[PDB]
C-alpha cells in the first residue's frame, strides 16, 4: 500500500548545476512500454 509525501514546489532554479550530454538515439518502443536501442 502506497502513500505520497510532498517534496517541494515545481520551480525553475536560477543557479542550478548543469550537466549531462545530448545524445541522438534511434529507439523503438514496444507494447510493454519499454524503449530499446535500434542499431
Amino acid at each position: 500500500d502506497m502513500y505520497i509525501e510532498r517534496a517541494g514546489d515545481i520551480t525553475w532554479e536560477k543557479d542550478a548545476e548543469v550537466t549531462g550530454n545530448s545524445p541522438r538515439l534511434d529507439v523503438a518502443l514496444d507494447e510493454s512500454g519499454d524503449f530499446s536501442l535500434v542499431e
Binding site: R6, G8, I10, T11
Partner: protein, 154 residues
Amino acid sequence: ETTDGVYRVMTRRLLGSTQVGVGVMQEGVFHTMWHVTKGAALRSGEGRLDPYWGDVKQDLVSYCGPWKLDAAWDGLSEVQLLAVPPGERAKNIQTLPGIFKTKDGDIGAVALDYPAGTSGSPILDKCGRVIGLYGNGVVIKNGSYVSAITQGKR
C-alpha cells in the same frame, strides 16, 4: 494534502519505508509513471487517491482526474530535471536534452542517471511548466542511462 507540487511515492510493504517513485500534483490530479504504482490506489494522509487514467505503453498514470500536463520541450532550450532521489532533498539539474528518434516521431531525452525510486520526477522548462516525467529510458553502449521526456496528452 492536495497542494500543487512534487511528491514522493512511498511504500511500507518492503523493509522500512521505501521510495518507489515520484509524481506531480497539479490542478487536483496526481501524475506519475505507470511502472511506479502499477495502477494501484494511493494514500494521501487520511485520504485515498484512485486511478483515473493510465497507459502501460506510455508508462503514465493519473489519479483523481485526467492527465493535466501539456507543456512540451521546445527542441532548443535547456531544461531542468527536478530530481527527488530516495531519502534526499529535491534538487534541480539543468541539461540540454538529446533526442529519441522513433518510427512515430522524435521526443526529447535527458542523459541523467538517478536511483530507480526517482522515477516520475518532473522535467521543467524555463517557465516552470512540467514538460514530462523522468524514468522510462534506455542504457547506451557506454552503460549510461538516458530517460525519455515522457509527456501525456491533455
